[PDB]
From a paper:
Exo-β-mannosidases, hydrolysing non-reducing terminal β-d-mannopyranosidic linkages, are widely distributed carbohydrate-degrading enzymes. We show that these probes covalently label exo-β-mannosidases from GH families 2, 5, and 164. Structural studies of the resulting complexes support a canonical mechanism-based mode of action in which the active site nucleophile attacks the pseudoanomeric centre to form a stable ester linkage, mimicking the glycosyl enzyme intermediate.
CmMan5A bound to compound 3 gave the highest resolution structure at 1.3 Å. Supporting our hypothesized mechanism of reactivity, compound 3 was covalently linked to E330, the known catalytic nucleophile, through its pseudoanomeric carbon. The ring was found in an OS2-like conformation, providing the first direct evidence that the GEI conformation for GH5 β-mannosidases matches that of GH2 β-mannosidases and GH26 β-mannanases. The amine group from the opened aziridine is found interacting with both the general acid, E215, and an apparent buffer acetate that also interacts with the axial O3. C7 (taking the place of endocyclic oxygen) forms a CH/π interaction (3.4 Å) with W285 while the alkyl chain extends out of the catalytic pocket, forming hydrophobic packing interactions with W285, W135, and a hydrophobic groove between N288 and W289. We speculate that these interactions contribute to the observed tighter binding of compound 3 over compound 2. Indeed, the first four carbons of the alkyl linker display well-localised electron density (B factors of 16–25 Å2), indicating rigid binding and suggesting that a shorter linker may hinder binding into the active site pocket.
Numbering used by the authors: 23 to 431
Write the structure that this text describes.
């Protein structure tokens, strides 16, 4: 019983399936059997998530070893081809745990950004030069150009396909299931937020990006003809603000469904220090972004998942006891509009909040993750508490539970 696509919606055993999800990048890490893992916590997190109506996690499948202090440590890939089999047993365990609970997972295999190593880490290994952490340089245009250089590197593509092959052809070491046979996996996903480059991307670079999405999705389908494939794109914003790049990249049959993300604070629509003043304008831009991507989903006749979206705590606090009124009202507005869209038969096929902190805790004064600290939905490139929902965020969890039930057929 795999998750399938039929037009603008997902089906499971021929019944509509709607994604009522969270991002939990570290869920497979939690499954590791060694000191990196926390299997007791993983079971408790999944129990709590299931109790609040979550059916789907979006999870990082692979990381690349990094020496920067904005990235997960340890890594799955300790230089090209040097995979940590003990950490892969954590993915095996996560898949067993999700199956017990009738939850699914979307697994992404790379990262535009630095927090799992990702595309810039590929390039650093190839060139024998260290990664420039954009949290240190504040040189984001240069970072995005460097990350997109990955698509043009034949060596990087060979290693990336090596990595896709290593996971897709895996046998679950616990239950013996081939990954290609495991219905717990909803989708393979090319990367987290792949973009074509920076704001100065050329027409040739846009075409390289489009061709990369097509060829990578085709390659996965050679290994696995039946799991869904998605890109992990943010949408228009992840397409150098060119909706035609989004359309062209995702028009291939091998992309089964569409993704979009929304980052109203990172995109400068919302100012976390002036929330009352900036929310009205930010909400106008968000509702327009949602309609623009629902309209593209109708044109391509594919489901659309808002698989990553979040908002700061009130006044940008990282503290657990800070209020989340702006986040909660944003989530309400998104869920109201998306539920209306689903009622009207449009390809709105659900969501994954960014992100789930659950029982994870920091005791770092500066909220900055260090190796050995609890993993949170906020990865190591962001303060622990920036975007994640803690178990104690009662107001937010009530909204999630309410709408998770309303979105279920």
């Amino acid at each position: 019983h795999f998750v399938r696509v039929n037009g603008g919606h997902f089906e499971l055993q021929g019944k509509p399936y709607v994604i009522t999800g969270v991002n939990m990048w570290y869920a497979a890490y939690l499954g590791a059997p060694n000191e990196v893992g926390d299997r007791d916590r993983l079971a408790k997190e999944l129990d709590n998530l299931k109790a609040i109506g979550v059916n789907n996690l979006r999870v990082l499948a692979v990381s690349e070893k990094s020496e920067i202090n904005s990235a997960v440590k340890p890594a799955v890939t300790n230089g090209f081809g040097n995979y940590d089999e003990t950490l892969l047993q954590g993915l095996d365990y996560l898949l067993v745990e999700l199956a017990k609970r009738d939850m699914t997972v979307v697994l992404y295999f790379n990262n535009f950004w630095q927090w799992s190593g990702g595309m810039t880490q590929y390039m650093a290994w190839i060139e024998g030069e260290p990664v420039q952490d954009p949290n240190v340089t504040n040189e984001w245009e240069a970072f995005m150009a460097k990350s997109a250089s990955f698509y043009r590197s034949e060596k990087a593509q060979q290693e990336y396909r090596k990595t896709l092959e290593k996971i897709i052809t895996r046998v679950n070491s616990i239950n013996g299931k081939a990954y290609v046979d495991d219905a717990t996996i909803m989708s393979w996903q090319l990367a987290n937020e792949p973009r074509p480059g920076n704001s100065q991307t050329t027409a040739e670079e846009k075409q390289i990006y489009i061709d990369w999405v097509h060829a990578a999705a085709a390659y996965i389908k050679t290994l696995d003809a039946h799991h869904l494939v998605s890109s992990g794109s943010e949408g228009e914003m992840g397409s150098v603000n060119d909706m035609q790049v989004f359309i062209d990249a995702h028009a291939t049959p091998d992309i089964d469904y569409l993704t979009y993300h929304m980052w109203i604070r990172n995109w400068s629509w919302f100012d976390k220090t002036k929330p009352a003043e900036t929310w009205p304008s930010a909400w106008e831009k968000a509702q327009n972004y949602m309609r623009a991507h629902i309209d593209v989903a109708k044109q391509l006749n594919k489901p659309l998942v808002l698989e990553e979206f979040g908002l700061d705590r009130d006044m940008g606090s990282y503290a657990m006891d800070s209020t989340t009124e702006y986040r909660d009202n944003y989530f309400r507005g998104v869920f109201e509009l998306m539920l209306a869209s689903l009622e009207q038969g449009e390809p709105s096929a659900g969501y994954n909040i960014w992100a789930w902190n659950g029982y994870g805790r920091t005791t770092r004064a500066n909220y900055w993750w260090q190796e050995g600290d609890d993993f949170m939905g906020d990865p190591p490139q962001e303060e622990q508490g920036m975007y994640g929902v803690f178990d104690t965020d009662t107001s937010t969890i009530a909204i999630m539970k309410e709408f998770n039930a309303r979105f279920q057929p």
